[PDB]
């Protein structure tokens, strides 16, 4: 997260860390949607142009975390994966279309003050909340700047970061990039003339873009951090997987499995 700030403890209890076993490194964000299912971006796990193809045994999922690096003995739960499911029509060749994946935990996690699932939206929520100019929230442990001076600058955050960003009109999204955008994506960020900044960055991918409904007080996952071009560039916007448009696939996978 570029130009965000420190999360409060428990502010995002559905935030999941994808953790590589060997070498030990932060892979990506994810989110908790029930006691045994985790939602993330497909490109976190599978991207053949860079020979990236992670397996159930390559990864741990860490839930309830605040610190990026500490083993938070009293608070976090570490789980292994039973099975990974990638959208069958996930398009890694040209635009990261349908950038979505589900992961089933080997055992259920116990909820607590620090571990709690986010809601997926229904039709009415999606139609009310997904409108240009409205703001959602992005969280993660990814980089604080696109680039920095080696061994001097920082870098990676020490605790979870948070930034609030407005949804941007579809035509402005389209004009900002040569990449072919589909209806399975939306874009968010400030416009160059607005004098605020903020973006997701490396390591934030797969994490949740969430919105709060004023009428029932619940948080909904509307997007997944998918892609962009650098971090926090002027006249550039982050792109997000459209969770609602892909809800039917989620429903199939959870029901069948």
């Amino acid at each position: 997260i570029v130009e965000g700030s420190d999360a409060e403890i428990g502010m995002s209890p559905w935030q999941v860390m994808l953790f590589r076993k060997s070498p030990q490194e932060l892979l990506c964000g994810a989110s908790l949607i029930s006691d045994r299912w985790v939602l993330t971006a497909a490109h976190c796990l599978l991207y053949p142009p860079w020979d990236k193809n992670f397996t159930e045994n390559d990864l741990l999922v860490r839930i309830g975390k605040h610190s990026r690096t500490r083993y938070e003995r009293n608070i976090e739960k570490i789980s292994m994966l039973e099975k990974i499911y990638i959208h069958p029509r996930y398009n890694w060749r040209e635009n990261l279309d349908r950038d979505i994946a589900l992961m089933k935990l080997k055992k259920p996690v116990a909820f607590s003050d620090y571990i709690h699932p986010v809601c997926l939206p229904d039709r009415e929520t999606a139609a009310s909340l997904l409108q240009a100019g409205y703001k959602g929230r992005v969280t993660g442990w990814g980089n604080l700047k696109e680039t920095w001076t080696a061994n001097v600058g920082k870098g990676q955050p020490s605790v979870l970061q948070v930034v609030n960003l407005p949804i941007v009109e579809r035509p402005v999204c389209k004009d900002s990039t040569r990449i072919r955008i589909t209806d399975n994506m939306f874009c968010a960020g400030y416009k160059p003339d607005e004098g605020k900044r903020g973006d997701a960055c490396e390591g934030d991918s797969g994490g949740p873009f969430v919105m709060k409904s004023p009428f029932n007080n619940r948080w909904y996952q509307m997007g997944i951090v998918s892609w962009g071009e650098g971090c926090d560039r002027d006249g550039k916007y982050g792109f997000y997987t459209h969770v609602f448009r892909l809800k039917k696939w989620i429903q199939k996978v959870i029901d069948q499995f």
Binding site: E8, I9, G10, S112, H116, K212, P214, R218
Partner: peptide, 30 residues
């Protein structure tokens, strides 16, 4: 019924609000 979701034990459930959520809600009414 439907499993509880999107209500945070340390915030909504204790009627506390986080430092910046007010910014999100205000965006709905401009």
């Amino acid at each position: 019924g439907e499993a509880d979701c999107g209500l945070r034990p340390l915030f909504e459930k204790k009627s506390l609000e986080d430092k910046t959520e007010r910014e999100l809600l205000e965006s709905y009414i401009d």
